[PDB]
Amino acid sequence: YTVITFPFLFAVMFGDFGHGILMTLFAVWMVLRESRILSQKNENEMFSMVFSGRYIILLMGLFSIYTGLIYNDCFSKSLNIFGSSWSVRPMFTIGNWTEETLLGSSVLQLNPAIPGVFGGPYPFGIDPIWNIATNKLTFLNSFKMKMSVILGIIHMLFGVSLSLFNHIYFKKPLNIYFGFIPEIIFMSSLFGYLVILIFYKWTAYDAHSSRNAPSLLIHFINMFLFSYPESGNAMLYSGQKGIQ
Amino acid sequence: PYNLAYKYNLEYSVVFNLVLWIMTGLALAVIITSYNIWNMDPGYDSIIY
């Protein structure tokens, strides 16, 4: 049931394009030589484990290649394919941040970071400009944590949902109608709400929409904790209190 | 003295702190190494008697 969606093919989270191609090359050379490898004597028990795992190693290499492509970090150096979005001349000429040729190298060291008339995501992955920037850490941290939450919630939801089929196969209607429905209900009501909130925050805002303060990063991911007793303020869109 | 003035102190913070800390560090080093050399173990094998 799992194979690919298992936590053994998303067992990369380190895809660096080149690292994936290296793993695939090693595993492919080893699979091409498996005949003489099994025909010849074994080298060491670790080699025996690697021989038992060759198939998983190769397919994990393919998935690492794909994850490196979507991450757009080839040996920690990004790849520019079919545009990169962003610019500087529109940001400075329109934004009155011009005449910083040498003044920007004398007065505004590492200062300029403002979106003017911009936007539009990379058609495939993450823009290389985020890689060559210095706010890379914050944006990547927020993106990876949100991807974390969504991936983990959908995975655990699928894992629990498989148990419903597992139990309906083994008759037992009392447990199905009394033991696992509460589990799914609680899990959904506590985590799918967080996932939907993450997606809503992602979709229902824009660059020139931060509340008063310039950026605020996210400012709503964590203050909506697992209890949120009262007060809160900030984001209080109508109905959210009642739904909570 | 026409008036009971102070002791005309100096930049007490830096000199006092640094002197006290180097003094206690050197003293602690001395006592710890003298304690280590105090309990030197010759071995006390059967040769002793």
């Binding site: 964590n222 904790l225 | 304690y35």
Partner: protein
């Protein structure tokens, strides 16, 4: 035991010096010089905040390390005769590691309320900032210490249960409750760490 003697000597000497300097200060009618308020004021709140964050994550991680090694040695010792325990008991190990996780996310939340100052004087500039810095340092110390201590407790209990499993493999389920009680105690620590820094403004 020489290290213990040195530590005890430093402890007693420092405390004797402290009590003698306190009695000298109160005798010589020099109380105003021994100003705790000036110490808590002129000291930068940034140090308190960052030290709280560092301790919050570091105590958690070192308590988790204590637990994981104190249980792993037990597992490897007791798993020679019964290799089947090399993996099945692992359900009591991740607790300790998950305990360490209860730090990093916590270490994020407090770190989520850090701002620069651009101010130096303490008069009417920093009152709420003073409260925020001290409160977040206290929350960090709370989570770090509680998480470390629950980690060491859970590791101890897990080692005990792992050695119990070496003879009868059917008591692990009946004995799983103690370590989840310890993990819940760590959860209480994390909860109060949340509540302490829940309503604090920094700036």
């Amino acid at each position: 035991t020489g290290l213990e003697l040195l530590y005890l000597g430093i402890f007693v000497a420092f405390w004797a010096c402290m009590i003698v300097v306190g009695i000298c200060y109160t005798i010589f009618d020099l109380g105003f010089r021994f100003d705790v308020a000036w110490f808590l004021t002129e000291t930068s709140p940034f140090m308190w905040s960052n030290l709280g964050i560092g301790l919050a994550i570091s105590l958690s991680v070192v308590g988790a390390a204590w637990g994981i090694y104190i249980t792993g040695s037990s597992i490897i010792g007791g798993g020679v005769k019964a290799p089947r325990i090399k993996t099945k008991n692992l359900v009591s190990i991740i607790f300790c590691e998950a305990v360490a996780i209860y730090g990093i996310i916590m270490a994020i939340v407090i770190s989520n309320m850090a701002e620069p100052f651009s101010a130096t004087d303490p008069k009417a500039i920093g009152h709420r900032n003073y409260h925020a810095g001290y409160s977040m340092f206290g929350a960090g110390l709370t989570v770090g210490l509680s998480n470390l201590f629950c980690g060491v407790c859970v590791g101890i209990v897990g080692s005990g249960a792992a050695l119990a499993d070496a003879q009868n493999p059917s008591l692990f389920v009946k004995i799983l409750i103690v370590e989840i009680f310890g993990s819940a105690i760590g959860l209480f620590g994390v909860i109060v760490a949340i509540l302490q820094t829940s309503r604090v403004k920094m700036g």
